[PDB]
Amino acid sequence: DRLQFRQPSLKRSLMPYFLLTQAVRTGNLAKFNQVLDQFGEKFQADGTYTLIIRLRHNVIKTGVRMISLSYSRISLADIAQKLQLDSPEDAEFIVAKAIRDGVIEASINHEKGYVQSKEMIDIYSTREPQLAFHQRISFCLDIHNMSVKAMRFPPKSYNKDL
Amino acid sequence: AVQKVVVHPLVLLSVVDHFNRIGKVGNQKRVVGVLLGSWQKKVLDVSNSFAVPFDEDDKDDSVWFLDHDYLENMYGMFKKVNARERIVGWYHTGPKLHKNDIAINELMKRYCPNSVLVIIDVKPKDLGLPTEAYISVEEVHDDGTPTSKTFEHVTSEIGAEEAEEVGVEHLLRDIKDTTVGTLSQRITNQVHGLKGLNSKLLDIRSYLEKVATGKLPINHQIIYQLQDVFNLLPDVSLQEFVKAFYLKTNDQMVVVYLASLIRSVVALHNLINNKIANRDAEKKEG
Amino acid sequence: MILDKKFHGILDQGEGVLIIFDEPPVDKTYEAALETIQNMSKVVDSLYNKAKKLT
Amino acid sequence: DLYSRYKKLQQELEFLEVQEEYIKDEQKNLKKEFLHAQEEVKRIQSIPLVIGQFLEAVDQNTAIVGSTTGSNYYVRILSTIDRELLKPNASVALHKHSNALVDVLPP
Amino acid sequence: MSEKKQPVDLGLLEEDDEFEEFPAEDWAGLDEDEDAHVWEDNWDDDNVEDDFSNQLRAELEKHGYKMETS
Amino acid sequence: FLDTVSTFTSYELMDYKTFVTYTVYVSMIALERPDLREKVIKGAEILEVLHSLPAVRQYLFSLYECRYSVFFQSLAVVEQEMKKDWLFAPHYRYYVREMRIHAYSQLLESYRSLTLGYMAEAFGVGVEFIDQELSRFIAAGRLHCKIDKVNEIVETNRPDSKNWQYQETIKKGDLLLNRVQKLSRVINM
Amino acid sequence: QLTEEKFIVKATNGPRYVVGCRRQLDKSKLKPGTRVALDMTTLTIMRYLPRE
């Protein structure tokens, strides 16, 4: 949200947007679908409802991304009911639509029918670090060293007149 | 017995004198000078030397000509001016160890104590160290071959005492000192692979020639320890050494933040003075 | 006494496993991070001089 | 003139061009000379030396020094040492021959 | 350019002309509890607050009843 | 509150025992076990005034003793006490949650892997609540690395010492990087 | 003794100096409270001087 900048222009700018942008994370379908168009005046009068109409079915994808930030196994009552999505097929199906993204880490397994995931969010700390911040070293040193060029040449632009 | 020697550059400059006082005859043999030094401490320390007229034959190697009276007179007058140094050994400036050099060596093994031999080079085109200390010892051999005088390399360093540094450094004005940082590090880091390259390539090619075309006990036994230690590095799998590369790479990241941060601090006076000097000299120029 | 850090260890309830480990190089990230934070006021106070002198 | 200004000017392009690698040669060589004379005036400063005592600084970068023998000496001090070591009652240490100060000693 | 700030600010004056000091005072009802409190904390407190403004706001009073029932 | 040796009944503003009653919150939440053992468990000033109310001694000794089954049984008094107060009201949402995550970090610090049985016995709560708790405390609370339920057991990794001790500074490296991009914005204009 | 290698000496005749350490001897006898022996050249230490 607006965290580190305090000015009452962006504040009034998000004064309509706040209820829906807090309504992103909990992601309740039937309520927030009414909430958007309900007081929708200027953000839905801003034109052609495009990225909010992508938002309307991005709700369950960001919510199931919070499920990816939650535990591994997918239940048929608890988390399927919790995602307002009550069937064996659509659970593994739309979770599988998050699997075909590649943004996650998951293990499609059927032993008894329950779907696993290894859900490993382990960072590269003791996991191939040299190759990992290898590119960070090269890019960062190039930025810092072209900044070294940016403190070489403007002193040339200082001593040029004299 | 003796681990290392110290040879001062004065005697090798007297080998420049060996190549000065020739007089252009057409001989240019391995002219032997009488090496002087300090056998007193366990380390050997060469201070100075002189030379003696030495002749061999064209065909015969075993004809060789020295002098005892010249040795006792030059060493006598030298001991009269400086008795803090005594006779120690000798040297020939030829690149090659002749068969006769055991017998030429034997005269100074008799009258002097256990004498050291130094092989140096007539033309200093060798990138390697010109001086090699070869201890004159008889060693017992495992094959059962009879015991003979054997020249094992004693490691050497070339150092100057005090004034030789000053005079040499005044004569050069071309060499640069230690000078840690970019240049003196990175030049060793330039030619350094060439320095092991010409060593190894200079050795294994004619060595490989003496593999197929060689006999007469080339120390065939030291090939087993040689190739053994060479096979003590069997192209390491790096799997444990991965984290070592995280270690040197993380020290590298420390050098990243130090270089970036500290140079960015050097940017301060630059990016202040660039404005405040120019615009104020400008606005008070008119 | 792990919470008061009198020694190195960490426990377990499912497996009952004890693991003992240590971190010796403490003085790198300290001096690094404090060099960053002390250079913050250098750059920001520089921007106060330059934001003073331009606008 | 007008079309001759082109090819006339090209020679000034070349003559200003030739100053580039020249100023590269100077900027690479004279800093090597700077660490030459820098290390050479550094190796003048040697640790065997005599210790005197400071009495007064009569002007900037030149002062007087009481020797251990009691005779007062007039020495232009070395430029690298800042004004902290101009303390009037100090444990100053000159050279044994150069008789210029490298460092003062803590009492 | 910063002259394209001008029609965007005409939009801003239309936004301020939607409600005239109704949101400054009423939202200042929350700001008077929220002024000088660091608003990075008010995003976390607003996050879990608005999360539990729907249901189970205090709820620690209920956990003692969740002991025997769960 | 370190002057509480010298603080006194101040009827111009605030009673001394109410000064103790208000400083027990900022100490009780905002300070850790080296902080509490350093200042107040060492300090005799709270050792005097703990005899005034027996609840406060429970909220220090059972919290410090990490006994959740009694601390949550008694924490409702901190809840109802926590509201209805003049200067102490609007943050009552924050002290609760902050104290919960500080307690869960207190247990979860010395513990690598954790069954839900000993955990549910420890808190005296159903597993259904600690399920959504720490799931909200991965993203929302942001306490530790990812927790898994393939074995239905709390397992953290927490590689927060070795490499993360170095990578706490990449944030300031990027912020200084954008700040020297601002320094580049100073250039020529 | 300021540097562990290099310290202050006090001559019998009165002027004070600072000297180095010889590569042969070690820091055992080089601790303070030890009267020593020095050279005109390089101000080196060959050995110490035991008082009596």
Side-chain angles (χ1 to χ4, degrees):
Chain A
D1 288 331
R2 186 187 62 82
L3 268 65
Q4 64 184 356
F5 286 166
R6 179 186 60 80
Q7 56 267 10
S9 298
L10 279 70
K11 291 178 72 67
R12 291 179 179 91
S13 300
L14 194 142
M15 277 180 182
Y17 207 83
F18 183 73
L19 184 62
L20 68 95
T21 193
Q22 189 62 256
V24 170
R25 291 171 176 171
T26 59
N28 197 0
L29 296 171
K31 300 291 187 180
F32 294 151
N33 194 1
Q34 186 59 256
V35 170
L36 295 170
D37 196 1
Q38 182 65 40
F39 64 95
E41 194 270 331
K42 186 175 174 65
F43 62 95
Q44 79 181 2
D46 201 2
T48 63
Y49 55 85
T50 59
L51 195 53
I52 190 166
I53 213 72
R54 297 187 186 95
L55 178 59
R56 282 182 61 248
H57 288 179
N58 201 1
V59 168
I60 198 65
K61 186 165 72 66
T62 58
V64 82
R65 189 171 297 167
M66 187 62 207
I67 299 301
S68 71
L69 297 172
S70 177
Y71 298 95
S72 174
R73 309 291 182 90
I74 179 162
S75 178
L76 195 147
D78 288 331
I79 202 160
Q81 181 184 0
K82 189 177 75 66
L83 292 173
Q84 294 88 21
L85 183 141
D86 47 358
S87 176
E89 291 86 3
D90 58 358
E92 192 271 332
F93 186 74
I94 299 171
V95 162
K97 300 299 178 291
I99 289 167
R100 64 181 289 276
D101 298 331
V103 298
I104 48 93
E105 172 166 350
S107 172
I108 304 98
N109 294 313
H110 294 88
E111 181 70 26
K112 64 189 76 63
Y114 290 167
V115 179
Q116 283 74 12
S117 70
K118 56 188 176 294
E119 67 170 2
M120 182 179 284
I121 318 171
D122 180 73
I123 58 176
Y124 66 91
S125 297
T126 66
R127 187 63 177 169
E128 295 292 329
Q130 303 88 16
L131 191 147
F133 61 92
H134 181 275
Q135 57 180 355
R136 176 66 181 173
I137 286 165
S138 67
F139 285 162
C140 84
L141 281 174
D142 285 329
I143 296 299
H144 301 107
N145 201 359
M146 74 179 286
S147 301
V148 170
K149 302 296 182 183
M151 66 173 283
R152 284 169 187 173
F153 190 78
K156 272 78 175 176
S157 296
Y158 159 61
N159 207 356
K160 58 177 283 183
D161 57 354
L162 54 92
Chain B
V2 170
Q3 183 177 1
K4 67 180 182 294
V5 306
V6 174
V7 174
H8 283 81
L10 174 59
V11 61
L12 293 176
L13 188 136
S14 180
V15 176
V16 182
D17 185 74
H18 282 71
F19 299 148
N20 193 0
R21 65 178 181 270
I22 294 172
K24 276 353 77 232
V25 289
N27 204 356
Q28 60 266 10
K29 289 184 290 188
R30 49 193 69 249
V31 176
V32 174
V34 180
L35 179 64
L36 308 176
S38 177
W39 186 260
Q40 188 177 5
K41 195 175 285 187
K42 191 184 290 183
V43 64
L44 192 153
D45 183 75
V46 173
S47 297
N48 197 359
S49 298
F50 66 96
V52 54
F54 173 75
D55 289 328
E56 294 177 354
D57 195 0
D58 194 1
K59 293 182 180 180
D60 183 78
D61 196 3
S62 297
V63 170
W64 57 279
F65 291 149
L66 287 178
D67 188 355
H68 301 287
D69 195 1
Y70 184 81
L71 186 144
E72 293 294 327
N73 288 318
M74 286 290 105
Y75 178 70
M77 297 174 185
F78 179 73
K79 194 171 178 68
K80 187 170 75 174
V81 62
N82 194 359
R84 293 182 179 91
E85 186 181 4
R86 69 265 190 96
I87 36 88
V88 58
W90 64 281
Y91 58 93
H92 67 89
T93 187
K96 295 293 184 181
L97 183 65
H98 276 79
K99 184 182 179 183
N100 200 6
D101 299 332
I102 182 174
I104 304 167
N105 195 6
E106 187 66 31
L107 190 147
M108 297 183 189
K109 190 172 183 179
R110 292 193 301 270
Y111 293 96
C112 302
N114 29 8
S115 330
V116 67
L117 194 153
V118 170
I119 287 178
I120 48 175
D121 197 0
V122 288
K123 275 78 178 175
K125 299 180 178 66
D126 194 1
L127 194 148
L129 206 157
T131 295
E132 288 85 7
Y134 290 159
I135 189 167
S136 174
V137 288
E138 292 184 353
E139 291 178 353
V140 176
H141 197 274
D142 199 4
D143 200 3
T145 60
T147 304
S148 179
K149 184 188 284 186
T150 304
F151 293 156
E152 181 179 0
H153 180 73
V154 170
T155 183
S156 177
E157 61 177 357
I158 307 300
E161 191 271 330
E162 178 65 28
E164 190 174 5
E165 299 177 354
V166 183
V168 160
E169 188 175 1
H170 176 73
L171 282 162
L172 287 170
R173 293 291 177 269
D174 196 359
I175 195 169
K176 194 185 282 186
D177 291 331
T178 302
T179 66
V180 189
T182 171
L183 43 96
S184 294
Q185 192 175 2
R186 80 180 188 259
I187 287 170
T188 63
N189 301 130
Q190 277 173 353
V191 196
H192 77 94
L194 188 146
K195 291 183 174 69
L197 178 61
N198 59 359
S199 178
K200 178 182 175 184
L201 185 66
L202 189 146
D203 289 322
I204 70 172
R205 291 292 180 266
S206 177
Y207 166 74
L208 259 54
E209 182 70 29
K210 300 301 288 184
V211 169
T213 63
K215 51 176 71 65
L216 281 86
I218 53 179
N219 197 355
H220 182 74
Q221 179 60 44
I222 207 64
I223 303 172
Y224 300 105
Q225 184 180 1
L226 175 146
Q227 186 179 0
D228 194 2
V229 174
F230 292 166
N231 289 115
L232 288 177
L233 188 67
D235 289 331
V236 175
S237 298
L238 279 310
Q239 294 297 321
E240 185 63 30
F241 207 77
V242 166
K243 183 68 177 69
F245 278 160
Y246 172 69
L247 192 143
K248 185 66 168 67
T249 304
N250 198 355
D251 300 331
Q252 170 63 259
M253 178 63 78
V254 174
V255 182
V256 169
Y257 288 159
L258 288 174
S260 67
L261 265 62
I262 293 300
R263 289 288 294 167
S264 299
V265 170
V266 181
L268 189 150
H269 304 89
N270 302 316
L271 305 176
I272 289 170
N273 289 317
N274 58 355
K275 303 297 182 290
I276 61 97
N278 295 323
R279 70 188 174 89
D280 291 331
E282 189 270 331
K283 75 184 291 184
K284 299 303 290 182
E285 180 179 0
Chain C
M1 293 184 286
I2 281 100
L3 286 174
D4 288 330
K5 292 183 176 67
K6 81 173 188 69
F7 77 106
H8 289 284
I10 182 162
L11 293 174
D12 190 349
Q13 280 73 11
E15 294 178 352
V17 167
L18 179 61
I19 299 172
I20 299 167
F21 65 97
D22 59 355
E23 191 266 329
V26 189
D27 204 3
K28 301 298 291 184
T29 66
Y30 280 174
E31 296 175 354
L34 288 174
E35 270 171 341
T36 63
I37 297 169
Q38 287 190 357
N39 288 318
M40 289 301 297
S41 65
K42 311 297 185 289
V43 182
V44 170
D45 285 332
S46 298
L47 289 169
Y48 289 163
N49 290 115
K50 300 184 297 289
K52 176 179 71 68
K53 74 182 71 176
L54 295 178
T55 185
Chain D
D1 285 329
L2 196 276
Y3 197 73
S4 175
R5 184 172 64 192
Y6 183 76
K7 193 176 287 183
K8 177 69 175 178
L9 185 56
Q10 296 293 320
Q11 187 175 1
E12 183 176 357
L13 271 67
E14 294 174 351
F15 187 79
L16 193 61
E17 187 272 331
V18 76
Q19 306 302 319
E20 289 290 328
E21 191 272 332
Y22 172 61
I23 201 68
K24 300 293 182 294
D25 290 331
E26 281 181 345
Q27 76 180 356
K28 72 179 290 185
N29 289 316
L30 275 81
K31 60 173 67 174
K32 297 188 290 291
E33 298 176 355
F34 179 72
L35 54 90
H36 273 292
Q38 177 65 40
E39 287 176 350
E40 281 169 352
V41 301
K42 179 64 174 66
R43 62 186 289 267
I44 298 302
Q45 289 184 353
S46 296
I47 309 101
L49 55 84
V50 66
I51 292 96
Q53 63 185 358
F54 193 79
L55 194 149
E56 282 179 352
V58 292
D59 53 354
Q60 179 60 40
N61 290 316
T62 306
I64 64 171
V65 49
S67 67
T68 308
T69 63
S71 63
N72 293 318
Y73 291 164
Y74 179 75
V75 169
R76 179 170 180 80
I77 60 98
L78 195 144
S79 64
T80 308
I81 286 93
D82 55 355
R83 64 182 292 274
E84 193 275 333
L85 285 76
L86 293 174
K87 188 174 180 180
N89 45 2
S91 176
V92 74
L94 300 174
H95 280 287
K96 58 182 178 290
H97 287 86
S98 299
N99 287 113
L101 54 91
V102 178
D103 187 70
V104 299
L105 301 175
Chain E
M1 287 78 77
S2 297
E3 295 183 355
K4 298 180 183 181
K5 294 182 180 181
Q6 288 184 355
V8 179
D9 289 335
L10 291 174
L12 286 184
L13 291 176
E14 289 182 352
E15 292 180 0
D16 296 330
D17 284 327
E18 289 178 354
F19 287 157
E20 286 290 325
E21 296 291 323
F22 262 161
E25 291 177 353
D26 291 331
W27 287 101
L30 278 77
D31 292 331
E32 68 178 1
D33 289 330
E34 196 176 0
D35 195 2
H37 295 99
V38 176
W39 293 268
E40 191 270 331
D41 187 74
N42 291 313
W43 170 68
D44 286 328
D45 196 2
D46 201 356
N47 194 1
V48 176
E49 187 269 330
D50 198 3
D51 197 0
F52 291 165
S53 64
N54 192 3
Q55 286 295 110
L56 60 100
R57 183 181 62 80
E59 177 60 30
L60 270 69
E61 298 172 354
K62 190 180 177 181
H63 289 92
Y65 295 153
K66 290 171 68 177
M67 293 179 185
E68 67 273 14
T69 63
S70 297
Chain F
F1 64 93
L2 194 63
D3 60 350
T4 187
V5 180
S6 65
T7 65
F8 190 69
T9 302
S10 177
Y11 65 94
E12 296 185 354
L13 291 176
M14 285 180 183
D15 193 3
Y16 175 76
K17 64 182 180 181
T18 64
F19 176 75
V20 176
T21 309
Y22 285 162
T23 190
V24 78
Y25 287 103
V26 59
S27 65
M28 188 178 67
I29 287 93
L31 275 75
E32 62 179 1
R33 298 182 70 190
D35 288 332
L36 293 173
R37 186 175 181 269
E38 179 67 28
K39 291 184 180 180
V40 292
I41 302 168
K42 184 188 288 184
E45 295 84 6
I46 198 69
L47 295 175
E48 294 178 353
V49 299
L50 58 83
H51 299 88
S52 179
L53 291 177
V56 178
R57 190 174 66 244
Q58 297 175 357
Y59 297 123
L60 297 175
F61 286 173
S62 66
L63 181 70
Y64 186 79
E65 196 174 1
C66 194
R67 288 183 180 268
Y68 300 103
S69 297
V70 62
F71 181 71
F72 292 161
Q73 179 66 40
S74 62
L75 190 57
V77 183
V78 188
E79 172 66 27
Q80 298 176 357
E81 186 182 4
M82 187 181 286
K83 61 183 179 180
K84 303 181 296 297
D85 197 357
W86 176 258
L87 193 61
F88 189 71
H91 319 295
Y92 80 104
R93 298 296 308 276
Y94 178 70
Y95 289 108
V96 171
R97 180 190 68 193
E98 180 66 31
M99 202 173 191
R100 299 295 286 272
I101 186 172
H102 189 71
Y104 299 158
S105 66
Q106 180 176 359
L107 180 142
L108 191 61
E109 176 67 27
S110 177
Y111 287 154
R112 175 184 58 246
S113 174
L114 279 161
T115 180
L116 292 173
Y118 176 76
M119 179 171 288
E121 289 291 326
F123 294 107
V125 74
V127 185
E128 69 275 10
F129 184 68
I130 61 174
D131 195 0
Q132 66 179 357
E133 281 177 355
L134 297 177
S135 181
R136 285 171 288 161
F137 292 120
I138 293 300
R142 188 176 178 266
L143 42 77
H144 289 90
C145 57
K146 182 62 187 294
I147 182 175
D148 195 0
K149 207 188 284 183
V150 292
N151 300 114
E152 299 174 357
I153 281 171
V154 172
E155 181 177 359
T156 191
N157 191 1
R158 193 256 184 190
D160 295 334
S161 298
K162 296 294 186 291
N163 197 2
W164 181 254
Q165 193 184 4
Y166 287 91
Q167 296 181 1
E168 285 168 351
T169 62
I170 196 166
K171 295 180 183 291
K172 302 293 183 182
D174 287 327
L175 196 146
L176 187 144
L177 189 144
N178 199 2
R179 193 173 293 277
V180 300
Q181 287 176 355
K182 170 63 172 64
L183 181 66
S184 180
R185 180 166 291 273
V186 185
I187 302 300
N188 292 319
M189 186 179 290
Chain G
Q1 185 176 1
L2 282 76
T3 304
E4 69 272 16
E5 296 292 328
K6 300 179 294 295
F7 49 86
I8 303 172
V9 297
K10 296 298 291 183
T12 302
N13 201 3
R16 61 185 66 87
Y17 297 96
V18 286
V19 302
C21 177
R22 182 166 175 259
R23 58 173 176 85
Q24 180 61 253
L25 59 92
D26 292 333
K27 278 80 176 177
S28 179
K29 68 183 178 66
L30 193 144
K31 64 175 71 174
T34 297
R35 184 166 178 83
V36 296
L38 295 171
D39 188 358
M40 55 167 287
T41 61
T42 319
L43 298 176
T44 187
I45 306 168
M46 292 299 171
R47 60 187 180 273
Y48 70 102
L49 181 61
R51 62 173 176 85
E52 183 177 1

